Amino acid sequence: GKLPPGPRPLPLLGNLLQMDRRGLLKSFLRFREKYGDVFTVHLGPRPVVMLCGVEAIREALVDKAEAFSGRGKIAMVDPFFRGYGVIFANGNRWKVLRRFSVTTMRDFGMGKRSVEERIQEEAQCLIEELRKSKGALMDPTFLFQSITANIICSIVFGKRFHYQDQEFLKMLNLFYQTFSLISSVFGQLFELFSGFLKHFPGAHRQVYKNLQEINAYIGHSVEKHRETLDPSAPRDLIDTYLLHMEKEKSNAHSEFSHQNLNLNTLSLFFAGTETTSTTLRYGFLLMLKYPHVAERVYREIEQVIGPHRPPELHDRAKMPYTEAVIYEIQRFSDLLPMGVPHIVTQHTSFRGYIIPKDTEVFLILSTALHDPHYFEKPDAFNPDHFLDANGALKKTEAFIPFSLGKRICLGEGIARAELFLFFTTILQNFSMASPVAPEDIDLTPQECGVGKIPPTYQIRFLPRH
Numbered sequence: 001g002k003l004p005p006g007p008r009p010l011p012l013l014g015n016l017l018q019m020d021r022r023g024l025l026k027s028f029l030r031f032r033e034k035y036g037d038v039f040t041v042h043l044g045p046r047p048v049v050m051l052c053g054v055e056a057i058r059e060a061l062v063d064k065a066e067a068f069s070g071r072g073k074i075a076m077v078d079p080f081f082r083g084y085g086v087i088f089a090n091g092n093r094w095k096v097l098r099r100f101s102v103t104t105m106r107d108f109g110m111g112k113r114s115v116e117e118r119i120q121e122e123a124q125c126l127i128e129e130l131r132k133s134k135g136a137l138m139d140p141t142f143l144f145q146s147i148t149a150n151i152i153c154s155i156v157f158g159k160r161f162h163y164q165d166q167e168f169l170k171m172l173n174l175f176y177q178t179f180s181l182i183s184s185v186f187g188q189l190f191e192l193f194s195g196f197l198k199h200f201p202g203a204h205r206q207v208y209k210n211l212q213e214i215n216a217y218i219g220h221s222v223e224k225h226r227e228t229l230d231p232s233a234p235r236d237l238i239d240t241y242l243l244h245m246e247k248e249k250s251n252a253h254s255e256f257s258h259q260n261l262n263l264n265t266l267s268l269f270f271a272g273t274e275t276t277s278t279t280l281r282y283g284f285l286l287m288l289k290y291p292h293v294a295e296r297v298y299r300e301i302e303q304v305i306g307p308h309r310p311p312e313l314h315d316r317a318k319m320p321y322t323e324a325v326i327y328e329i330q331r332f333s334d335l336l337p338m339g340v341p342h343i344v345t346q347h348t349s350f351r352g353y354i355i356p357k358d359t360e361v362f363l364i365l366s367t368a369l370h371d372p373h374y375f376e377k378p379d380a381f382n383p384d385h386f387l388d389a390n391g392a393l394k395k396t397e398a399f400i401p402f403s404l405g406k407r408i409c410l411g412e413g414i415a416r417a418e419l420f421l422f423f424t425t426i427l428q429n430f431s432m433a434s435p436v437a438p439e440d441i442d443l444t445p446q447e448c449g450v451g452k453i454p455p456t457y458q459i460r461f462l463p464r465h
């Protein structure tokens with residue numbers, strides 16, 4: 001009958017005075033030193049249980065899924081989402097939204113394109129755009145958000161936007177700034193003291209205002225889908241939801257509400273755009289720092305695919321090196337180092353500790369991805385972390401960047417397809433250069449909070465021959 005151990009808190013400040021200035025993640029890795037894999041930290045007024053290492057995390061999300069499957073809050077965006085949409089929902093609202101989103105993120109209608117096909121098409125558009133740049137320097141952030149946003153758009157809104165569309169780019173800008181502001185030092189501090197800091201000016205207000213501006217776009221798209229809805233031929237995920245709404249309207253407790261429609265839709269957009277693109281940004285920075293890996297990846301593309309046939313998912317199994325590189329990009333880039341917060345949904349016992357219902361829990365995914373027993377020298381980028389003796393692909397159970405269990409990333413199959421196809425399709429057509437010599441490329445993230453965000457950089461894409 002005790003919570004996990006941890007540093008002794010003060011009233012009001014919780015463990016603030018024991019924290020590391022460099023962030024939550026660093027704070028928690030120090031605590032782990034002292035207390036081991038399961039400990040309690042008081043983030044202002046809330047005790048939060050931290051679980052570290054693949055064994056503890058898997059034991060919680062998979063073996064104790066009846067208790068560890070709740071969703072906790074991200075203080076920076078809770079005032080906006082308020083438990084609407086699939087990411088932030090619990091209970092029956094979650095079950096409904098998850099079932100809906102999973103099915104509709106995969107089955108689209110006979111004669112509608114596959115996931116692979118939309119990605120393949122977006123990849124050709126991206127290569128045509130990169131050709132048109134003629135080797136000019138760019139920060140590729142906007143293009144990497146455009147291609148990942150466009151895959152979600154084709155599912156959600158039934159169309160794609162053009163790369164030079166300044167309105168499309170305005171919404172990409174809002175998603176980008178929001179993810180940065182959520183992961184900033186302020187955003188981390190807000191996680192501790194949201195109750196106090198919310199009365200004052202700060203980034204939380206800018207985040208809230210950004211999300212309302214994206215929400216206004218969605219609300220208008222929804223209305224215009226409603227006006228043109230053909231109940232016999234759903235175009236996209238919005239039409240499918242409208243039909244469920246119509247079908248359940250006689251139940252006042254239907255979860256197909258207007259607020260879930262907007263916020264689930266937003267949720268999918270945010271997650272679909274900022275995750276994969278951020279991974280891509282890091283991956284191309286790593287290719288600049290390790291041009292020998294990129295050159296090896298090209299050799300493999302040449303031998304297995306050739307210089308012109310578009311890459312397809314069937315190529316994956318014949319490309320162990322490219323796959324190792326992409327896993328290692330994900331491992332090293334550690335997109336969500338503390339995952340997304342969980343909450344326990346019933347009184348539970350965990351390695352002797354007793355964790356009461358409603359206790360918030362962070363799974364520190366970063367500790368699995370940097371576990372030195374699975375990855376020798378885990379702080380260095382090295383695709384050999386994923387290769388055996390023969391150069392064959394060695395997967396491992398510590399590779400959990402999508403989490404595990406009931407709340408495991410529902411975009412996983414999409415993200416993996418997007419990483420492989422965009423990565424290989426770009427390298428099939430271009431090598432990369434930049435004004436910064438490999439030795440001087442600094443990989444230090446620009447933010448490290450909920451999200452790990454790479455520094456900005458310039459790069460050129462040089463066409464092959």
Ligand code: HEM
Pocket residue numbers: 071086087088098105267268271272273275276279335336339340341401402403404406407408409410411412414415
């Ligand atoms: C590199 C790409 C991605 C990574 C590393 C990633 C990682 C994650 C993680 C760690 C979670 C939290 C799981 C948990 O709560 O324990 C999550 C949830 C989620 N992700 Fe992904 N994600 C990626 C791409 C995507 C994409 C492309 C989509 C959209 C198609 C997406 C949609 C979602 C949704 C809707 C949830 C909430 C699931 C739920 O709470 O039921 N993610 N993701």
Ligand SMILES: OC[C@H]1O[C@H](O[C@H]2[C@H](O)[C@@H](O)[C@H](OCCCCCC3CCCCC3)O[C@@H]2CO)[C@H](O)[C@@H](O)[C@@H]1O
Pocket residue numbers: 149153161167168169171172214216217218220269
């Ligand atoms: O109808 C009234 C409203 O219209 C103007 O806002 C527009 C701007 O006129 C207009 O340029 C705009 O075009 C956006 C198209 C790009 C959509 C990109 C999507 C990417 C995926 C996630 C959703 C957004 O959409 C916004 C919402 O319609 C205004 O911003 C708001 O005043 C006002 O509330």
Ligand SMILES: OC[C@H]1O[C@H](O[C@H]2[C@H](O)[C@@H](O)[C@H](OCCCCCC3CCCCC3)O[C@@H]2CO)[C@H](O)[C@@H](O)[C@@H]1O
Pocket residue numbers: 012013045193195196197
């Ligand atoms: O005592 C009653 C109150 O307590 C619950 O919430 C509190 C928590 O009790 C209480 O801890 C809180 O104060 C926290 C002080 C945090 C110190 C400020 C830090 C901010 C920047 C970094 C250094 C200092 O403010 C919140 C709002 O008052 C409630 O939010 C309010 O109902 C209620 O007014």
Ligand SMILES: C=C1CC[C@@]2(C(C)C)C[C@@H]12
Pocket residue numbers: 077087179182270271275340450
């Ligand atoms: C992919 C995700 C899951 C939760 C999240 C928030 C900022 C939308 C970090 C984005």
